[PDB]
Amino acid sequence: MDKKTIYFISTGNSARSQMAEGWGKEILGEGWNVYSAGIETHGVNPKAIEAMKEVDIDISNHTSDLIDNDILKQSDLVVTLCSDADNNCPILPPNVKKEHWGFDDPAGKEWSEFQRVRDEIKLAIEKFKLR
Numbered sequence: 213m214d215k216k217t218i219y220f221i222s223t224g225n226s227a228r229s230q231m232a233e234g235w236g237k238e239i240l241g242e243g244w245n246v247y248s249a250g251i252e253t254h255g256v257n258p259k260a261i262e263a264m265k266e267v268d269i270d271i272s273n274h275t276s277d278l279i280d281n282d283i284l285k286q287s288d289l290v291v292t293l294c295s296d297a298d299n300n301c302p303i304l305p306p307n308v309k310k311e312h313w314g315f316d317d318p319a320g321k322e323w324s325e326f327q328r329v330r331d332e333i334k335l336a337i338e339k340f341k342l343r
């Protein structure tokens with residue numbers, strides 16, 4: 213069979229969606245197409261790159277993409293990673309297989325917060341693999 217698709221969307225495509233794309237590529241590897249996008253495109257966060265390098269995953273070559281409506285409707289799973297009321301949580305079309313996995317925004321915080329969120333995102337993806 214062909215690969216299934218998981219889309220990790222958020223307020224931006226800088227930290228949480230990028231660390232999720234990173235863990236998604238490594239854990240869900242051969243059976244899943246793992247993309248990520250955001251409402252805002254602020255580039256790939258420097259501390260998220262460094263946090264993922266600490267666990268031997270390279271995300272420095274990821275792109276900062278905007279949310280494309282075609283991929284939302286065609287995915288097997290769309291995961292919103294925003295904090296359900298911060299500012300700018302994604303707009304989703306009907307019949308789109310969605311799920312909400314909330315994680316705190318580490319933007320502007322110390323390196324330790326990127327570490328904490330990285331490992332919460334890891335555990336979530338590891339739990340997802342064995343469903």
Ligand SMILES: [O-][Cl+3]([O-])([O-])[O-]
Nearest residue numbers: 224226227228229
């Ligand atoms: O994915 Cl985020 O850049 O919103 O953390």
Ligand SMILES: [K+]
Nearest residue numbers: 248275276277
């Ligand atoms: K991306």
